[PDB]
Amino acid sequence: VLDGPYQPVAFKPPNDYWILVNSNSNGVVLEGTNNTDVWVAIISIEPNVNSESRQYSLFGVNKQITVVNTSNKWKFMEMFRNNSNAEFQHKRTLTSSTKLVGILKHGGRLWTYHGETPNATTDYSTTSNLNEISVTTYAEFYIIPRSQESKCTEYINTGL
């Protein structure tokens, strides 16, 4: 039914595979780059947080990011840039009671979940260099084939 768990590690994910990270911490859940046109980092925020600046380490560099989470659910912020010299931008948001986050390499695109559980859906970032995107996890994760994406969407939205 479920492949894993795998320990936090840096690796190059194979295409058509969901990486389902079981978040617990509230720092950097996840980050990935191909060093050419993709830098993504999923950041975690605990419930009931008022607007404030917090410190995060993105790819070996400390950054200052304003965060807010008035909700009762955990907030997962997707940070993005397509240029090595640019700053990161708050691209997408995932509001979850399950604390689960996924990332996928497919169809020349990088996929993530966003929205609010139990109704989180997938979305994409464009790249010219999908295969070379390596990913670093900071919590235990599972591996799920794209043919069972419906299973992944269910775990994201209702948990394990």
CATH code for position 136: 2.60.120.200
Ligand-binding site membership of 46 (annotated): no
Tally the domains of the chain. 1
Ligand-binding site membership of 78 (annotated): no
DSSP structure string for the chain: --EEEE-S-EE-PPTTEEEEEE--SSSEEEEEE-SSS-EEEEEEE-SSEEEEEEEEEETTEEEEEEEEE-SSSEEEEEEEESSTTSPPEEEEEEEESS-EEEEEEETTEEEEEEEETTS-EEEEEE-S-GGG-EEEESS-EEEEEGGGHHHHHHHHHH--
